[PDB]
Design a protein around this ligand. Structure first.
Ligand SMILES: [Ca+2]
Ligand SMILES: [Zn+2]
Ligand SMILES: [Zn+2]
Ligand SMILES: [Zn+2]
Ligand SMILES: [Zn+2]
Ligand SMILES: [Zn+2]
Ligand SMILES: [Zn+2]
Length: 434
């Protein structure tokens, strides 16, 4: 990482989206992007499930068939996965590490797919639970490894009618994380540093907790719910972070409907993970499963200058949004956005807050404007009294410096929110000369 490292709360890039171009070109494509992302300040990349899926060439990895086939055996109609070959993935990992960029594996262990029809004694009918033909010959399995079985019928949850893995069985524990021949062992052996656990509401937190006890590494769980209490409960029990879906929805409530107050209220009344425990919050503006925020500039300006650990969605960075503004925000996040937060001003369409700084980052002032006009405000920010502050985004159309005299008062300006015309709706300030 050029600036902050992953464990230091550096910015993360979700290096994919739903239905990325197939043909096994993804691993090499992302690898060609490491140099640029390195210079941009990306500290880690989150890659899609790497194992051969039931849908083979069309698989996004969430319907894993042969865990130990990272695109190396002809199976399910293809040698490479939709993303590429095992060597291409390994090479991608190595290139990332050459630049100090960490790699996060998307771990899909709630369900499995592509098994052969097999008569099931616990259901009284045929189920696709026969995984004895796995080309890798590793972690084979049958109905006993899925619900229902002689242990219990069900667990926390299921998904898309796919065989639901029973992590309580020793065979399954051994093959997934409890041994040096385990899936976790394999992923690590090729260089994966951290983990992103898929659909964790489908099984117990004890699974992630033990996985982590064995391998460690940065970890986040996809616990999709709006109840902060449930998310933090799982976070603490598993030992991992959680995606801040609560913040996600509140940002949409605010930024997409001129309702900044809804976000302020949420942040103040612990209605988001980040406002409760910032060390457990992995923030985002969009992911491959959901993308409801249309006013993404104020959104990115917020997760990249506010507390928490931000994730940049590939499609926003490499397709839909102005890359330079995001790169600029990444720089601001790693150099200025530190410390506690103080809300300075807010109304229906404006939000101004101060980051008081930490030992590495001086702090800053974020001014988000959702209105269609240029705005200005006299704000009291004693944190910057006696200093020269500079607007770091360039969103004001030019180089703007201002003196915050001893008084602590300063007139701050923000551009209109009209991204369709190049006005992004936000300005970020901090001491001049950083
Ligand atoms: Ca389950
Ligand atoms: Zn290839
Ligand atoms: Zn079970
Ligand atoms: Zn999910
Ligand atoms: Zn929206
Ligand atoms: Zn790029
Ligand atoms: Zn206003």
């Amino acid at each position: 990482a050029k600036y902050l490292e992953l464990e230091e709360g550096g910015v993360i890039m979700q290096a994919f989206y739903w239905d990325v171009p197939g043909g096994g070109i993804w691993w090499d494509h992302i690898r060609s992007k490491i140099p640029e992302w390195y210079e941009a300040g990306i500290s880690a990349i989150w890659l899609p499930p790497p194992s051969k899926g039931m849908s083979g060439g069309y698989s996004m990895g969430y319907d894993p068939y042969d865990y130990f086939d990272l695109g190396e055996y002809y199976q399910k109609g293809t040698v490479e996965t939709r993303f590429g070959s095992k060597e291409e993935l390994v090479r991608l990992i190595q290139t990332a590490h050459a630049y100090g960029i960490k790699v996060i594996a998307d771990v899909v262990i709630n369900h499995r797919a592509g098994g052969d029809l097999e008569w099931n004694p616990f259901v009284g009918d045929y189920t696709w639970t026969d995984f004895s033909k796995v080309a890798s010959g590793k972690y084979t399995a049958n109905y006993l490894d899925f619900h229902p079985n002689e242990l219990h019928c069900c667990d926390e949850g299921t998904f898309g009618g796919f065989p639901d893995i029973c992590h309580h069985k020793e065979w399954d524990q051994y093959w997934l994380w409890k041994s040096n021949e385990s899936y976790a062992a394999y992923l690590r052996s090729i260089g994966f540093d951290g983990w992103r656990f898929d659909y964790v509401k489908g099984y117990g937190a004890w699974v992630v907790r033990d996985w982590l006890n064995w391998w460690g590494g940065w970890a986040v769980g996809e616990y999709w719910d709006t109840n902060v209490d449930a998310l933090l409960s799982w976070a603490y029990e598993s030992g991992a972070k959680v995606f801040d879906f609560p913040l996600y929805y509140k940002m949409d409530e605010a930024f997409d409907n001129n309702n900044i107050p809804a976000l302020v209220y949420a942040l103040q009344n612990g209605q988001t993970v980040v406002s409760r425990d910032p060390f457990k919050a992995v923030t985002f503006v969009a992911n491959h499963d959901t993308d409801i925020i249309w006013n993404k500039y104020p959104a990115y300006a917020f997760i990249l200058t506010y507390e928490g650990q931000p994730v940049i969605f590939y499609r926003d960075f490499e397709e839909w949004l102005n890359k330079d503004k995001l790169i600029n925000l990444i720089w601001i996040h790693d150099h200025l956005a530190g410390g506690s937060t103080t809300i300075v001003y807010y109304d229906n369409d404006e939000l101004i807050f101060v980051r008081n700084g930490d030992s590495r980052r001086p702090g800053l002032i974020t001014y988000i404007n959702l209105s269609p006009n240029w705005v200005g405000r006299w704000v009291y920010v004693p944190k910057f009294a006696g200093a020269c502050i500079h607007e770091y985004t360039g969103n004001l159309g030019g180089w703007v410096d201002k003196r915050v005299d001893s008084s602590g008062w300063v007139y701050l300006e923000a551009p209109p929110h009209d991204p369709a015309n190049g006005y992004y709706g936000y300005s970020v300030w901090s001491y001049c000369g950083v």
